[PDB]
């Protein structure tokens, strides 16, 4: 997260980091035993950590469980991402509890002009590299489907909605993939892509989790 803040220990108790060792991807709790995240976050050996403010720090708090199953969305392209978007089972159901906590799903999608809290550990950095220890946090709005189209011509799909500043100086970053956006307590994207980090007409491009919310339920009642 470029030109974000540091969100507070456990502000965002739906914020997980997935690790293979080290953090590579976030994602978001929507029930005790299942993580939505990005399908280009796909990989062998997740530990789903959840409770983590520093990630490199045991403050007390943290829940670590293997992941048991992994489930990319059937129609994931991974040279467009579009339906960049992956379930992922927890071996164990998380304790719940007031740091470790579900976001709903939506139940409709949102429209630009919405506010929207993204988070996560990715590079603070537009140039140069620069890795938190600690959850950082962006308030930014939904983007009008024709400012998104218009800064990536022929790279945005139906699943996908730019959040962020024409501006420039905030976005999400490499590291925050995967990670959620939340928009009204409703789970409205995940951190996918982007030209760059906070750079002038390229906004952060998420995926549009509305269009997965059928996907989702029908996926975790059969798994
Ligand atoms: N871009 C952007 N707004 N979001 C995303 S998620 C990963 C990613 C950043 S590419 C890494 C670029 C860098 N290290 N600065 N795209
Ligand atoms: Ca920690
Ligand atoms: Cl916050």
């Not at 159901?93 to 630009?112: D, E, F, H, Q």
Request: aromatic share 8%; charged share 10%; net charge positive.
């Amino acid at each position: 997260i470029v030109g974000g803040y540091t969100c507070g220990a456990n502000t965002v108790p739906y914020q997980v980091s997935l690790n293979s060792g080290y953090h590579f991807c976030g994602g978001s709790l929507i029930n005790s035993q299942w993580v939505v995240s990005a399908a280009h976050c796909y990989k062998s050996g997740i530990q789903v950590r959840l409770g983590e403010d520093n990630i490199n720090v045991v403050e007390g708090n943290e829940q670590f469980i293997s992941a048991s199953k992994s489930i990319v969305h059937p129609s994931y392209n991974s040279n467009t991402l579009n339906n960049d978007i992956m379930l992922i089972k927890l071996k164990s159901a998380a304790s719940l509890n007031s740091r470790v906590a579900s976001i709903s799903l939506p139940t409709s999608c949102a429209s630009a002009g919405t506010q929207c809290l993204i988070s996560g550990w990715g590079n603070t950095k537009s140039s140069g590299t620069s890795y938190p220890d600690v959850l950082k946090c962006l308030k930014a709005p939904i983007l009008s489907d024709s400012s998104c189209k218009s800064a990536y011509p022929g790279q945005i799909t139906s699943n996908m909605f730019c959040a962020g500043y024409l501006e420039g100086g905030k976005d999400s970053c490499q590291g925050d993939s995967g990670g959620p956006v939340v928009c009204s307590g409703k789970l409205q994207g995940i951190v996918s892509w982007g030209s760059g980090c906070a750079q002038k007409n390229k906004p952060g491009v998420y995926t549009k989790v509305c269009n997965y919310v059928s996907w989702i339920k029908q996926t975790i009642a059969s798994n």
